[PDB]
Design a protein around this ligand. Structure first.
Ligand SMILES: Cn1cncc1[C@@](O)(c1ccc(Cl)cc1)c1cc2cc(C(=O)NN3CCOCC3)cc(-c3ccccc3)c2o1
Ligand SMILES: CC(C)=CCC/C(C)=C/CC/C(C)=C/COP(=O)(O)OP(=O)(O)O
Ligand SMILES: [Zn+2]
Lengths: 314, 402
């Protein structure tokens, strides 16, 4: 292996062990469009990749070449496909390839190809033993990397590794209670384990969320989670909720609290509530305050809500 | 004053971290301080603010990129049809004609990009992939000539789509590749425009997409994942193409997207508790015209007759004051480097925000100088509405392959 960054790196056209092969230049046609003026290093590696792809040469040197083509452009999915062909055809040790993908993902975590490649290797080896820990290290650098969370969900689901994830969720929530990815992971773990029907679980969750809301009134994630686990069976199914939210309104107020209250008024006005002319006006006044003072960025949305609430509850 | 984000009341929209700091709040505060500087720059320099879309500067940027790019674009060597689409759409939005010689050149380049298997690759000889296939088809349609339409091998395209179809209703992005809601949209987009939709091609797709909607109201890449504007756009748009928008809880979705607009910045974020980004001016805001059309089809009587359900003015102020690179091209947020992807979507979003349309009604809101008005864009395909109708009618002149 001769690193693409090594001081003694040599273009492939100047390499003896490649003299037999004629590189294949890229054909962009007579009048190119969106033509990229590649560096000599790039064009050199890819002219030989094209040669090895055309001739479908499944050799150790071709395998080493894909590594350089990948490094020059990790987004080239065609190269990644040929590399997987070589892995099978050459019978390459897959853990060695696992160490390789571990390194490249650390380098470029926001790439679709690198994660899919890791998935294929895990699928091939039927071995998720390193996954949770590896993903955890990536998440320790970017706690919100979409691919990382997606890969974590896939591993946990396929190999049934649920036992310790909620603990992990609590760990990251303590580090940043505003991490929407962690709240999503929380709902992921719970809905695929115990579910939200067990009253002991639903209550536990609502209390935790309300408590987090008390700690950080303006954290939209806790509010969205609370709404998400209750709008299922309908907010009006829980009477104590309304007053309990109105209780922390003098101090822990936020445009989120106002909005939630409105979400309760509309469910009530939809499930035959008492004074269905008294609750309606409470809501319209809130839609008013929201659209006019407390949350004007969404004035068009709130004005729509008011008009829709009258359109069927007048 | 005339500008929403410069008014004194707006200062109240700054982030309140409740005295509990975390990576999220700190990072959201950094961007807000940076955006405020831009907003206050006019008062600071003692000048009257004027919002001008640097049409000329962006044009040069685009016109040049369409032909040649530096080695800085090596990372997009597997995304060239994308470059063709982003640039041509930008020029289209800026209402700049495409020389017949350039059009034919684009057509010939995408021909080389087309695979013998069907679909298009990210460049000559590259395996077909659904993202560049969507890009190629959209570009060819923007051109809209008989030549461009004929580049597409409809029979092979269908075959390719079928090779990616999974039993659960989803599609692979490419052979031996990954799956997420993007593939559903790319497949539905190209299959509908070219009229190759067979009775069973999208069987189960609508259901698989509906499974991607989560507790947040938005849509994730795959079932179980966090709600994200890019994926939510793909999901809904795909459903509108398949006529199954109904499969979604549209009310929870509407509430989620509207909450994605930043009260202070004016632009949108891609997901809850993350940073604002100019490209989401299309991915997120573009969902309002889709929901407006979906709700109206259900006979929703509360829908406005002149505005989309998001602050059109604020999104325009964000884009115009914070997303233009003085050298030409648009971007994520101030401090970031320009690129054609962000140029394409920042302009697409500006278009959405200044053009309302619901049947017989038409209402515009063009912030800043009048010359800022752009050509309208179709909310499903993100190409001109005329190009959609033109391409659609054209391919309807031929039967669905067998
Ligand atoms: C999440 N996000 C929010 N804002 C941007 C992103 C992005 O991370 C993203 C990830 C995945 C998806 Cl599906 C969509 C967007 C992203 C960044 C980016 C830059 C360029 C780009 O042109 N960068 N230039 C290259 C030349 O040097 C200047 C920067 C091109 C693309 C690109 C987009 C679609 C297809 C092919 C390519 C980019 O994509
Ligand atoms: C048609 C088509 C291809 C549509 C898809 C568009 C799109 C923008 C998809 C988002 C994919 C993604 C991995 C986002 C996370 O990036 P991030 O965390 O860096 O960005 P964020 O912080 O803004 O969420
Ligand atoms: Zn962006």
């Amino acid at each position: 292996f001769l690193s693409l960054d090594s001081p003694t790196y040599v273009l492939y056209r100047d390499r003896a062990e490649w003299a037999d092969i004629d590189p294949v230049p890229q054909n962009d046609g007579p009048s190119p469009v969106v033509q990229i003026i590649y560096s000599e290093k790039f064009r050199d590696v890819y002219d030989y990749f094209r040669a090895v792809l055309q001739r479908d040469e499944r050799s150790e040197r071709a395998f080493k070449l894909t590594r350089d083509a990948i490094e020059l452009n990790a987004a080239n999915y065609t190269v990644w496909h040929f590399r997987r062909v070589l892995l099978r055809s050459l019978q390459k040790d897959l853990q060695e390839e696992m160490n390789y993908i571990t390194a490249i993902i650390e380098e470029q975590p926001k790439n679709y190809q690198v994660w899919h490649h890791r998935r294929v290797l895990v699928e091939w080896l039927k071995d998720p033993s390193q996954e949770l820990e590896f993903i955890a290290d990536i998440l320790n650098q970017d706690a919100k990397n979409y691919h990382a969370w997606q890969h974590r969900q896939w591993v946990i689901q396929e190999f049934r590794l649920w036992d310790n994830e909620l603990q992990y969720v609590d760990q990251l929530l303590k580090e940043d209670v505003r991490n929407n990815s962690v709240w999503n992971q929380r709902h992921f773990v719970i809905s695929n384990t115990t579910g939200y029907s067990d009253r002991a679980v639903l209550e536990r969750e609502v209390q935790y969320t309300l408590e987090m809301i008390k700690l950080v009134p303006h954290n939209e994630s806790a509010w969205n989670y609370l709404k998400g686990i209750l709008q299922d069976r309908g907010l009006s199914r829980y009477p104590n909720l309304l007053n309990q939210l109105l209780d922390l309104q003098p101090s822990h107020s936020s445009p989120y609290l106002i909005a939630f209250l409105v979400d309760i008024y509309e469910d009530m006005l939809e499930n035959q509530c008492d004074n269905k002319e008294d609750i309606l006006n409470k809501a319209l006044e809130l839609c008013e305050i929201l659209a006019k003072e407390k949350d004007t960025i969404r004035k068009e949305y709130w004005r729509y809500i008011g008009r829709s609430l009258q359109s069927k509850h007048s | 004053e005339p500008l929403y984000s410069l008014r004194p009341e707006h200062a109240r929209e700054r982030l309140q971290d409740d005295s509990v700091e975390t990576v999220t709040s700190i990072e959201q505060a950094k961007v807000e301080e940076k955006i405020q500087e831009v907003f206050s720059s006019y008062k600071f320099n003692h000048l009257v603010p004027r919002l001008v879309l640097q049409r000329e500067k962006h044009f040069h940027y685009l016109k040049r990129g369409l032909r040649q790019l530096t080695d800085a674009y090596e990372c997009l060597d597997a995304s060239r049809p994308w470059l063709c689409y982003w640039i041509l759409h930008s020029l289209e939005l800026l209402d700049e004609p495409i020389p017949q010689i350039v059009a034919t050149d684009v057509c010939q380049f995408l021909e080389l990009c087309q695979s013998p298997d069907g679909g298009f690759g990210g460049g000559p000889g590259q395996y077909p992939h659904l993202a560049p296939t969507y890009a190629a088809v959209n570009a060819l349609c923007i051109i809209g000539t008989e030549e461009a339409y004929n580049v597409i091998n409809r029979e092979k395209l269908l075959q390719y789509l079928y090779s990616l179809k999974q039993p659960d209703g989803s599609f692979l992005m490419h052979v031996g590749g990954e799956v997420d809601v993007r593939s559903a949209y790319c497949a539905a987009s190209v299959a509908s425009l070219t009229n190759i939709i067979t009775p069973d091609l999208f069987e189960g797709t609508a259901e698989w997409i509906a499974r991607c909607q989560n507790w947040e109201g938005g849509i994730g890449g795959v079932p179980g994942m966090e709600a994200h504007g890019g994926y939510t756009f793909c999901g809904l748009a795909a459903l509108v193409i398949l006529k199954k928008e109904r499969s979604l809880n549209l009310k929870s979705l509407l509430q989620w997207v509207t909450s994605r607009q930043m009260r202070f910045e004016g632009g949108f974020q891609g997901r809850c508790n993350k940073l604002v980004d100019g490209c989401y001016s299309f991915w997120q805001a573009g969902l309002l015209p889709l929901l407006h059309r979906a709700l109206h089809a259900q006979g929703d009587p509360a829908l406005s007759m002149s505005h989309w359900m998001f602050h059109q003015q604020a999104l325009q102020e964000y884009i115009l004051m914070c997303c233009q690179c003085p050298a030409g091209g648009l971007l994520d947020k101030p401090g970031k480097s320009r690129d054609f992807y962000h140029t394409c979507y920042c302009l697409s979003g500006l278009s959405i925000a200044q053009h309302f349309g619901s049947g017989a009604m038409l209402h515009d809101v063009v912030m800043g100088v009048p010359e800022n008005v752009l050509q309208p864009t179709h909310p499903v395909y993100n190409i001109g509405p005329d190009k959609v109708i033109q391409a659609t009618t054209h391919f309807l002149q031929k039967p669905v392959p067998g």
